[PDB]
Design a binder for this molecule. Structure first.
Ligand SMILES: COc1cc(CCc2[nH]nc3c2Cc2ccccc2-3)ccc1O
Length: 263
């Protein structure tokens, strides 16, 4: 079919450009630029809560990554400052985030930079994990590798990344998911970084939940956050146990509004 390979770049999404196919009008996100590793990790991924990788093309010194377009934009833009969002919406996004993280950890990949800027939404508000530029393999041939590199974004990083030379990959991603859950439910980040020099972090370890952001969060999701934001990564809740949590399993969210008529 002629011209089926031509795409028009119509707007800047992030560089990342929205590309529209000249024939079919199919919309895709194109990343125009570590990049070999990002492509290699992306080629391994196939999950409904992970932004799809369609392929790559190299023209000279510029690398083009063809990726799934998520028209709902960033989760970050659904969080109202100092408010958050309705608890049933945050629960549904949290369920989708856990499905994506389970998947990645199951194939031995750690994201290392989970935050609302990197969690995108499709046309039906389905959450998709994006940006695998800091991601790495932590399990290969059923042998776990401890990590040592400083990766991430300070408000979302687990305390062991700042205190220990080596650390397990999975609890780090679990921690950042708990900071994402805090932001969704309170519209604010709890600390600049998880260090004893940070008053907000010390207040949390002293269980002062009568202070913000914790005072804005209902006791059932707050009980979950008490199990995720645990300083010792060996005592921190695992994802199979998050899936058994009371709030995680609480009925809150009605399904998508379907068309209906009366009489
Ligand atoms: C799945 O892997 C990646 C995905 C993305 C981006 C994909 C993508 N798809 N759709 C969008 C974006 C960014 C963005 C930002 C804002 C609105 C929409 C969109 C970047 C690097 C990646 O490695």
């Amino acid at each position: 079919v002629p011209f089926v390979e031509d795409w028009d770049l119509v707007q800047t999404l992030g560089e990342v450009q929205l590309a529209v196919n000249r024939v079919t009008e199919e919309a895709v996100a194109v990343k125009i630029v570590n990049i070999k590793k990002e492509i290699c990790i992306n080629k391994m991924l196939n999950h409904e809560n992970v932004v799809k990788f369609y392929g790559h093309r190299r023209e000279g010194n510029i690398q083009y990554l063809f990726l799934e377009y998520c028209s709902g934009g960033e989760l970050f833009d659904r969080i109202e400052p100092d408010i958050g969002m309705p608890e049933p919406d945050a629960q549904r996004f949290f369920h989708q985030l856990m499905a994506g993280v389970v998947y990645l950890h199951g194939i031995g990949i750690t994201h290392r930079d989970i935050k609302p800027e990197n969690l995108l939404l499709d046309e039906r508000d389905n959450l998709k994990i994006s940006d695998f530029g800091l991601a790495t393999v932590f399990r290969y041939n059923n042998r776990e590798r401890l990590l040592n590199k400083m990766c991430g974004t300070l408000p979302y990083v687990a305390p062991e990344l700042l205190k220990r030379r080596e650390f397990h990959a999975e609890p780090v991603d679990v921690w950042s998911c708990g900071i994402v859950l805090t932001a969704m439910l309170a519209g604010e980040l709890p600390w600049d970084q998880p260090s004893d020099s940070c008053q907000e972090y010390s207040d949390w370890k002293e269980k002062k939940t009568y202070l913000n952001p914790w005072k804005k969060i209902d006791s059932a999701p707050l009980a979950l956050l008490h199990k995720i934001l645990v300083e010792n990564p060996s005592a921190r809740i695992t994802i199979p146990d998050i899936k058994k949590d009371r709030w995680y399993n609480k009925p809150l969210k009605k399904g998508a509004k379907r068309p209906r008529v009366t009489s």
